[PDB]
Design a binder for this molecule. Sequence first.
Ligand SMILES: NC(=O)c1ccc[n+]([C@@H]2O[C@H](COP(=O)([O-])OP(=O)(O)OC[C@H]3O[C@@H](n4cnc5c(N)ncnc54)[C@H](OP(=O)(O)O)[C@@H]3O)[C@@H](O)[C@H]2O)c1
Ligand SMILES: NC(=O)c1ccc[n+]([C@@H]2O[C@H](COP(=O)([O-])OP(=O)(O)OC[C@H]3O[C@@H](n4cnc5c(N)ncnc54)[C@H](OP(=O)(O)O)[C@@H]3O)[C@@H](O)[C@H]2O)c1
Ligand SMILES: Cc1ccc2c(c1C)N(C(=O)Nc1ccc(C(C)(C)C)cc1)Cc1cccnc1N2
Ligand SMILES: Cc1ccc2c(c1C)N(C(=O)Nc1ccc(C(C)(C)C)cc1)Cc1cccnc1N2
Lengths: 393, 395
Amino acid sequence: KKISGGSVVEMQGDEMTRIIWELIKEKLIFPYVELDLHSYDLGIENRDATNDQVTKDAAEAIKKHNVGVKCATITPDEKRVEEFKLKQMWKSPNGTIRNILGGTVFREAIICKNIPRLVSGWVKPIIIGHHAYQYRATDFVVPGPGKVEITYTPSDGTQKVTYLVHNFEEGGGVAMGMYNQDKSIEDFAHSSFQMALSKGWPLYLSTKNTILKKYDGRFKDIFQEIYDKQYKSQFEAQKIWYEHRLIDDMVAQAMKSEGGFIWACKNLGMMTSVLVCPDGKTVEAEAAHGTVTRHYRMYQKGQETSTNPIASIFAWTRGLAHRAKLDNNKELAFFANALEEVSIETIEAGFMTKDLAACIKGLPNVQRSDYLNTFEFMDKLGENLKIKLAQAK
Amino acid sequence: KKISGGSVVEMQGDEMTRIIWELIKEKLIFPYVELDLHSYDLGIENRDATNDQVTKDAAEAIKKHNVGVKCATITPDEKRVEEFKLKQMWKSPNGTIRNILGGTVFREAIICKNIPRLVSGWVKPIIIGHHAQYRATDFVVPGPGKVEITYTPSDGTQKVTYLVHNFEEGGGVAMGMYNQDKSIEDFAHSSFQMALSKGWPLYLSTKNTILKKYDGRFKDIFQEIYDKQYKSQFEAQKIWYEHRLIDDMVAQAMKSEGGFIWACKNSLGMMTSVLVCPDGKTVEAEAAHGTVTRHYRMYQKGQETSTNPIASIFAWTRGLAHRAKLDNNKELAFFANALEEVSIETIEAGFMTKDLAACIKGLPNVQRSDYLNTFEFMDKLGENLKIKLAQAKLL
Ligand SMILES: NC(=O)c1ccc[n+]([C@@H]2O[C@H](COP(=O)([O-])OP(=O)(O)OC[C@H]3O[C@@H](n4cnc5c(N)ncnc54)[C@H](OP(=O)(O)O)[C@@H]3O)[C@@H](O)[C@H]2O)c1
Ligand SMILES: NC(=O)c1ccc[n+]([C@@H]2O[C@H](COP(=O)([O-])OP(=O)(O)OC[C@H]3O[C@@H](n4cnc5c(N)ncnc54)[C@H](OP(=O)(O)O)[C@@H]3O)[C@@H](O)[C@H]2O)c1
Ligand SMILES: Cc1ccc2c(c1C)N(C(=O)Nc1ccc(C(C)(C)C)cc1)Cc1cccnc1N2
Ligand SMILES: Cc1ccc2c(c1C)N(C(=O)Nc1ccc(C(C)(C)C)cc1)Cc1cccnc1N2
């Protein structure tokens, strides 16, 4: 028998990533895991045909079943409108999903010890998070001389404060009002603490509390208040810690570190993007790359392609590990981790796609024998996964 | 007989950079170029003794003489005030100079074929310049209530009110930001001037899809200034100006070979900072790093140092190249060019400081035999510059 995986929302996408997404299911997921699969086709022709209703239904399904795994999708522009003869310039599916779900986006690189890195000392992955909806900022044109003031009027009427933003004396310009609700800062803190707990790494928040004393100071304060009143014991029980750092000081210390921390910031086929909702229940994983149009155009002309599926595979493993965590499914938790180990071990043993071979040898030096095409790489992952799971019994 | 280099404003600085700066003058500039040198000592001690008046005078001299070359200076904090027994926590000399001159700062890395970078395809440098918010008005929203931003016209016409946010439950934070048209225009002029002098295309990146009014004014002003006064000059030089959304800009740059100016509305010894004034005549060149205090302490204790002088040498070469452009000085233009090529070529041939050796071999495997100390490196540049200039005499 296969592992009973439970309830998973799956989102199909476009171009080359749509092809490798089906190969991940066909060769790595379905031969070992049985799922109550809620599949939504977020392909550009389907989103056009349904007037983007499929994206909204897919977003509601993630809210209901707590686990979303998404394939890369085309965000329409004037060229795509002309290419597919679209009805509208459909909004980014990711934006629509994010708007309905809410949460914090965390990006994480997949580290293969034999693959070159910007900072060679980084041996453990760094996870970088930014809170999701400057979007809700009121900007405007100042047509000429005059004063721009910002006023705060409490609900009872009393303790009203007016601040001069600028007195324009020699002409016009622009001005804007920006805000941040406490709830959004608390959600950002929760998603960050819950992320650091599920990973088992220390958490660092970086602000500019020296430039924006009051604005960024409330981020530093809220994160500390939630840490002491709700997470300090859980962090100590997992030997990790939370600390705030100034961005200038944080960048400098990060270079001298070996990575392996969650980095909360106030302001390619080896990187994931995971939306972590404040509830600590709902997660949506996807590769942090696009649909790889250039490889898809080669595929369309009968040319052999060599597309890296690691980021797409890790969207499945991060989502399945989360599904296993919610359901206390030990066999699924094991599978999700074994698939990640196999992916890294295969590249570390020298079996990789052309892009990774180019990172090592340099593109002009890459020979056909230095890499595997899309299918051969998936088959090598499939053999190693069969072996790894057969050893585990 | 030395080159007549003309009028150049020079600013001396502090700690390790002050030492390197004197070696650059003594071994690479003075043996071949004679200048009507306007030197200002911006050392922490001199600024303290003169009550920062030296800084203001140096800034006025750059305005008058058009070319400034500056050594890195200590910006005081509470620890420096104790260390030097300063009368005040004097403002940053760069901030004082920028206040008097105006202009946009453009950073450009020095590329060496053997020194790794983010994208291997970037063979020509990318020059990035940001709009010169620190002057924003921020405050805490203690509880429920309305936050509005208003504009009262000076001509007595109707006051305009915008709702920033209505806090129905709980509080938060809020802020106001502004930008004057004149700064946006100055940013456009400095960027167009920078592109014309370098002979490279210019890209302005904004988030005009989100900040339709705020970033839309940057895009509109850059387009208006371009079409009405630079398009001809740009086409004549086979270059172009284009606005790009920050997302498309990051994508286009990754798949590029470098060689463009990037104005954006938002290893250290291998980057320069040039304050480019909107007039197209005034320029102030310096290294993007600081006074290298850690290295200075080692040098102070008689311990060997390996400090990268490239960024400081390029502050001089960019200023000399600007000077030659202003005076049509072909000999000074060739000299600045040759000093840049010697520096790059010396590194490329395996002669470099520890920081560069760490970029190729990785800090854990860098041996003493892989690099030259500060003095040994400067000597190697002096020796190669003499050879390059003698070989150039064959023209
Ligand atoms: N996750 C998402 O839903 C998402 C995010 C961004 C963009 N998009 C959409 O994607 C469409 C096309 O975007 P794009 O092709 O310019 O971006 P991209 O897919 O990220 O591809 C840019 C280049 O990066 C390399 N690359 C990226 N992913 C790779 C992988 N898995 N394996 C190997 N190489 C990989 C390829 O380099 P070479 O060309 O050298 O082979 C590729 O041509 C757009 O319409 C955009 O809206 C979707
Ligand atoms: N342009 C300016 O006038 C300016 C700008 C910033 C700061 N400063 C002033 O500089 C002083 C010291 O600041 P800081 O130590 O934080 O900054 P920094 O001087 O830029 O030095 C930081 C570190 O960067 C490396 N580094 C920088 N320049 C280098 C070079 N030319 N060659 C080799 N390594 C180099 C060294 O790393 P390792 O430790 O690995 O050797 C150095 O310790 C302060 O008093 C500050 O106010 C001046
Ligand atoms: C968005 C993102 C998220 C997570 C990661 C990355 C990126 C790109 N990576 C990276 O180099 N981030 C990075 C962080 C800071 C800098 C500074 C210090 C120059 C500001 C530069 C790059 C890839 C990388 C590799 C190994 C281990 N961790 C990572 N994590
Ligand atoms: C401040 C600065 C100015 C100029 C330069 C740089 C830096 C750091 N450099 C660089 O990597 N900038 C950079 C630009 C964009 C990105 C994105 C696309 C990832 C956002 C990342 C880095 C060094 C570099 C090397 C080769 C040629 N040009 C440059 N120019």
